[model samples]
Target chain A: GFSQLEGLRGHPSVVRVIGHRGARGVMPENTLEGFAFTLAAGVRALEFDVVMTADGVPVVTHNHHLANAMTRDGQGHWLTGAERQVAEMTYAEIRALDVGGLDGRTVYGRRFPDQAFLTGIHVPRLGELLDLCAGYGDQAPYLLLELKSDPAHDHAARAEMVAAVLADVRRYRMEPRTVMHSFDWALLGECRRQAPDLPTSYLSQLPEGPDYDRMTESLPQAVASAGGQLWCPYFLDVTPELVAEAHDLGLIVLTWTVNEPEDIRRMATTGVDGIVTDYPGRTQRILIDMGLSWT
Target chain B: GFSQLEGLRGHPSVVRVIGHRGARGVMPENTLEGFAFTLAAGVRALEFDVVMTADGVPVVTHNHHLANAMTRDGQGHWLTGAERQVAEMTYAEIRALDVGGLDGRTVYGRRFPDQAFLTGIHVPRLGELLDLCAGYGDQAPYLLLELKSDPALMHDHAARAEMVAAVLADVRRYRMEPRTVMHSFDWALLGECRRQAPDLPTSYLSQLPEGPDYDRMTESLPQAVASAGGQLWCPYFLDVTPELVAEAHDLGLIVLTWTVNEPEDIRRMATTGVDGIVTDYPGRTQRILIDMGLSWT
Candidate 1:
């Protein structure tokens, strides 16, 4: 009666510990340091966001725009210019900026004071990260690649974005270990056609006011129609009924950014496939104590 | 002005983060790994329990007998014998046992399922640990040493005197009396410390719940601790209240609560303005304190 995702890592059963934005609670978000730290803690799965640079290269970063609060300019000071989107900068420009430390005064940094800061952290190309993982040899971990797409962009741009990401995955031979994910269902549909074997995950939350792209159909229905293998909703958006419905449709249900012990317990008991968390250590411990495996 | 324990570490102001048995929630309690990990996390003070081996050597362990729940016998086997006491075994025999891993099936291990387990961990002597700290140079970490004594062995004056002599000998060798504390649940032993090692601070540890030989009087926990001529009061976290903290502060007795990890409970304890907290997760506590803009070392 266990889910298909169970025992994937040679365990009798396990609730997957997908590190949220590479353990954002403990290390800088979306940096190689964060990824390394999460893997060091025995967590084998990582969730991160990818945005396309103006030069058509994909890179790992949480926000589409280089939020001044989360980055520093080339001069080692806070970014003081008008907010610039990653789509507007070339990979070189992105590399020139520092993403290693969060501005402690910002709301995002304050929420995660435990985040460690270092100097000279540059944004990494998706291909470079894939290579980094491969360098770890037999211990290469799973990657959950979240594509950030701008619906307003022309079809050609979106298509090019998808082609670039697929090229990197193919180049690294990571199709088997990667999950192509996105909030935009259309992007997931494109991945389904381009790399049919690579699993796709759909992300959603309660629709914010006037946010047209937020799912209007039920999460399971939306993800199913898009041909996604996994449905990842906001933790608060999940319920027992939804999990059961997703299972019935052959879709695995995973929740995002669940950090509190109470929420982890609730989601664990809800029989979901996985719970993404900022503190994977906490999640792994809870799963072990609940007699579930995290291997 | 900062508390007496604060300015000693070169910090202008701060609440101390005392690692309870060397980050016991993450590593084997009272093991060298725990102490190293705690100090690596910027916690400059450690709290651990000490009991005498049959050879009269002071060794680090939470209980006098190797609780089956917390240890494995020599050669990686579970102890099925009539619970062998530390006082009944030689140092070589005690050293042969492994206290590194906890039995997850037991309640104590279940409480700290996240604790990392490893092989080849042995009980450390008090002198060995002090020497380890001394290796860290002049800024060596402080020690909150708890002596475990048995009331039934009250007639064993030789054992008591040996324990006191062994502890004082290490303190003198390392010149750590200035930063070291001698704490015990046995009030009588604390009095003995006051008479013998008056330079060392004594902490009064009490639980409100009544038990044999425990301070269970209804005269308020803080008042009893202050009257004991103790420099600090280590109280059970649940018994803490705003009034109790204020009373201790008024009496110039620094109050440190034990073993809190939940974020909500930590925030509540921080709000009560206690002097310090002893926790198994110094990393978590440091994060919480950093978010609240409190200085910690």
Candidate 2:
């Protein structure tokens, strides 16, 4: 009788706001502390990444490999040399380091020059977020739980990824609040095969195309045909025509990572069901300025 | 031992960051919740305003009169009518109102368009803030506590002393004198503060030249602040100069510039040799400092 889509889907008076990696522009992305800050900022939906560690713990972090620029080692120094793939590292090893702040000189650090530089923030496990969300009642966050698996994984290994994440949702009894999501179509297929009870979201980008505008109308049917209930396109790929097409196909169209004030206002006019953003407060303010609510 | 200037002042490797009005750009200004957010964001210094309630309790608020455009009543509606002076309303009356959010339709709201629109945030008493900081053993915030009086009677020395006395009582109860720095534009009131609590540091706030406050001043600003026993010079960012900063620093005083938010202005101010900078965007300031190879601790 109830569904997570009920909160995520847009209505006449409501446009949903999903915290992209727990408002990455405001707090350390994918950390429980960051999610708490996003909730403190009045955003109730979250989109976060989950990947299995070497020891098979599902930890929350954005990149598959820990970027040297954004991560600090045990002594609180940015990693001196190589990146460490999370899939090859034990959860304990990952947990010992901090992802609290960015090094300003790096290319990625300059992207969000205003993000808070904090200390003592560590990588959080996905179950911790599930537990946190599960603790909330009226203000419980709707989850767009994105799964990240190594491209080298076999088909059976991919299935294991889905099974582990689904078990977590089942353990927290959070299936009704979570939407299985991923950029990998293969992983999406496995998720649907195993847990057809939960809705699946397809995250997509064409990478490149000629006459992209003419090609967008076909994007919705592709997702719908693939058993995706939600279609999340990169902000640049979104168009009102495509959004309307997705709506006609009984699909919810949510746009990704919209942060610039003008871009957010522009995306609002596209009639997408929700917006995933790195700055939740900025999005909320712009939406309010348009006389829209992201409740 | 002389004051908390050791922690409050800047050195070659350090430039202090002060959260202005508990980061007004990111959170509701002067609210306890906002201060907590600032603290959680890793800013250990705070700049907030204080005024006296009709019931004689010292309360934290930016303006003498409750702003209709920024305040909501018991029924959760923006006060649609007249503005009430905090001086005329009892603490109980003032406490009922929420200053959590701004009406985005208002001119002031447009100024901080990205501030979180929160509910249930009420006006905090000065003691509550003192108590909140006192609880933090190491990360206790060094307060740049601005004292505001009813401007009409602001020149009254006795009333000024009364306000200072109430504030000092609260600070003393919390043993927060080590973290408290009395700040004001009214030099006369600050004089009363020095006379009453000689142990607390006094920060002199000067703004635009030829303004009401500056027009009344005759002596060279640095000499006057030094002669008046002021420990810190709080100048408006626009008023700061490398020359003035050097003058203040040479006079054994720390110069902390106020309300600097623009990135270019922050970089400009950072180069001026000011001991510290105050801003409503602490995170941005922290990043700017880090980019410049400086730390805010």
Candidate 3:
């Protein structure tokens, strides 16, 4: 009797886990190593971002450019400036940088005080990550895969990026177990058009919008308008009323990147459908103690 | 040449590490497992407390009573109350209680949040710890052995003599006389140790009085240490000042401070030119030393 997400769905107390960047608090985010570590910790879903390399292959990463905070050049010095982009380098060239240890002098490093240091980790490809999830046997986990692209420079390659990720998911036969997620509503719409069976999750940060005060539609309404099945908003932006409204609108509501115990408990009490966290082990312990089930 | 406290002495920048209870943050305090882990991390000096078993054997422990927060009974359950004292138990009986993990429900466990858990460790004997140091050969490390006995308890002449004799016997048999430091808050016991082994270095540990502070002392603290024929003055970390350290060094006394772990306090102590620092987390201090560009070896 193994646990599965689909079986746990429709249950009253189900709060599915979404490992934020595959447990970025412990290991390097978006690496196959971190993904395996998250899976070993009993997390049943993975959330990571995808960007394209120079050869049009999808790669897992958070930033469109290699960040100096989490990466080092071949000479062991911290990377400087934004001279490089993910779309400009081949997969082999992207693998040349080490993303395991943070440079302590950077502001990003100071944000995560409890991060453990391990060397020699690099960014992974989309196909490799899907293969890693498949290795978990009959209980293969689900994915909340985000498609990362800048509207300013990536306007021409948006269709290509969406097609590449869709092809990879089809190659691994994971369309049923995957939810195409993106901050850009247009990309999610493209995912909906390309694969009607695959569901799309909408990510939003309302405060970042200048027109939020004058917006005519609510967050759930905006997500519904985008044809998204789920509304994944910032943890601070979620409220109990919003969860109720989203549920009424036939959409599941999940919050992103909750770490504190009080907030996790608050979100659970607030009745969100899922919680995404960087420390899935700690979050899972809290959920277990509260008698909530997770896949 | 091997690394020794004497080799680093008189160098204003030297801050030799003294591992408090053998890296108490990670391993069970005062066990051989903790001591070996401390030594492996490049800490050269160990600061531990010694209590006597009923059979006059010197055992490594912090408290005279079996602390319920850190020990489990033979049946692997936390002791409900203080039912046994280390001084009244035989060596075999005292070894039955496991001191490997702290009870998380207690305040003692909350104090050390990052401590790693290990099982099957027991209170070690003074001889066993010295032999462990001796196994490291010519670079055999130093020890700051504190004799744990209350003044009222030591009023019995036989108890005092037996405890002192037991510790000195192990010190002599292991040939640790040169590297061993006799340290204690009880100045009278420190005087007795000086009388027993004139060549062994004695470190006098003290703190400022709450009301009058050190100003009420008839003589300076450093002068009191030198008058007692002591070589080092171990002060509470808060009472240490650049002027106090300067005065101690002027009196030909080396100054070491106790239990400093914060980076700000470590930088302050290092800047004040104290000869050594004793801490519960050796790896953290080692990393701080590396960051500050100080020689940790």
lDDT (CA) per prediction: 0.77, 0.86, 0.76
- Among the numbered candidates, top TM-score falls to 2
Model 1: how far is B264 from its true place, Å? 8.0
Q: State which candidate has the highest lDDT.
A: 2
Q: Which should have the higher DockQ, number 1 or number 3? A: 1
Question: Which digits, one per residue and each the tens of the lDDT, describe model 2 over residues B187-283?
Answer: 8888889998999999999887421246666776777899988998888999888998998889999999989999999999988988898998988
lDDT of 3 by residue, A1-295 (tens): 1122262243467787788998776556787766775665567788999999989889999888888888887786678887488888999999898876565566887565334344567788899998877766567787889988754445458888889999999898776678888888878877888877888788878674214688788989988877878888898999989988988997877798898878887887778888998877556656654767684
Question: Which ranges in model 3 have alpha carbons more than 4 Å from their true place?
Answer: A1-104, A108-295, B1-4, B7-10, B211-216
Q: Could you tell me the TM-score of chain A in candidate 3?
A: 0.92
lDDT of 1 by residue, B1-297 (tens): 223254223222456678899888766799876787566556778899988887878899988878887778767765665777778889999898888767766887778766654557899998888888777875578788899985546888767877887888887897766668888887778888878887777788877662223454666667777788888888888988989988988888878888888878887887788778888877677767755767564
lDDT of 2 by residue, A1-295 (tens): 3387898999876789999999888777888877888887778899999998888888888788999878998788889777888989999999999999998889998888878898778899888888898888666889999899875558877888889888888998888789988888778889989998889898888676123457554878878888889999999989899999999999988899898999999999889999999988778878877888986
In model 1, pairs of residues that clash are: none
Per-prediction TM-score, please? 0.62, 0.93, 0.57
Q: Each candidate: RMSD to true structure? A: 7.5, 2.8, 8.8
Give the per-prediction TM-score of chain B.
0.92, 0.96, 0.93
User: What is the DockQ of the complex in model 3?
Assistant: 0.05
